[PDB]
Amino acid sequence: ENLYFQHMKHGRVFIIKSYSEDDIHRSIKYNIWCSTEHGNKRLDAAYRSMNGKGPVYLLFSVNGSGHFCGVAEMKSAVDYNTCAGVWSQDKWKGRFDVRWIFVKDVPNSQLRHIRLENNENKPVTNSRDTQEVPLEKAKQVLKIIASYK
Numbered sequence: 001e002n003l004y005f006q007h008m009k010h011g012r013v014f015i016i017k018s019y020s021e022d023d024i025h026r027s028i029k030y031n032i033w034c035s036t037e038h039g040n041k042r043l044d045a046a047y048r049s050m051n052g053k054g055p056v057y058l059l060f061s062v063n064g065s066g067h068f069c070g071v072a073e074m075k076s077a078v079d080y081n082t083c084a085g086v087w088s089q090d091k092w093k094g095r096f097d098v099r100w101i102f103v104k105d106v107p108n109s110q111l112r113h114i115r116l117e118n119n120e121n122k123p124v125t126n127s128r129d130t131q132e133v134p135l136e137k138a139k140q141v142l143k144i145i146a147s148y149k
């Protein structure tokens with residue numbers, strides 16, 4: 001068995017959607033990310049109010065690719081005033097640190113049966129950027145990602 005995730009109460013988990021494969025590669029290389037304004041605001045609030053008591057995990061997926069590509073942990077608050085134009089599109093304002101945990105492709109077929117009660121019971125694989133995942137569903141997703149091969 002594997003009960004690593006039992007009794008974990010502090011932890012928050014979000015979907016990250018990237019239109020760009022390039023941005024994924026740059027995030028893996030330099031351990032940084034940036035979301036939309038409302039996306040950054042959601043993550044910064046969860047990171048700050050967690051106050052080191054647990055992790056904020058990020059489940060990355062390239063829109064249209066049909067698979068999740070990895071897991072990272074958020075490792076800083078959002079700096080909203082940073083160099084512009086470092087990503088594929090000039091849409092994103094700011095930067096925060098991440099630490100990538102898993103880089104592996106996990107087909108949506110492995111995850112589509114987990115549904116998010118906070119998003120109209122939709123499959124977790126039909127989420128938008130910074131969709132938050134309830135902790136109990138997030139544990140199921142993480143166990144799947146870690147044990148896929």
Ligand SMILES: CNc1ncnc2c1ncn2C
Nearest residue numbers: 017018019020023034035087
């Ligand atoms: C640099 N961050 C990003 N890159 C590409 N796409 C994104 C991003 N955030 C949200 N979406 C949809």
Ligand SMILES: [Cl-]
Nearest residue numbers: 017127128129
């Ligand atoms: Cl999106």
Ligand SMILES: [Cl-]
Nearest residue numbers: 128129130131
């Ligand atoms: Cl939204």
Ligand SMILES: [Cl-]
Nearest residue numbers: 133134135136
């Ligand atoms: Cl929850």
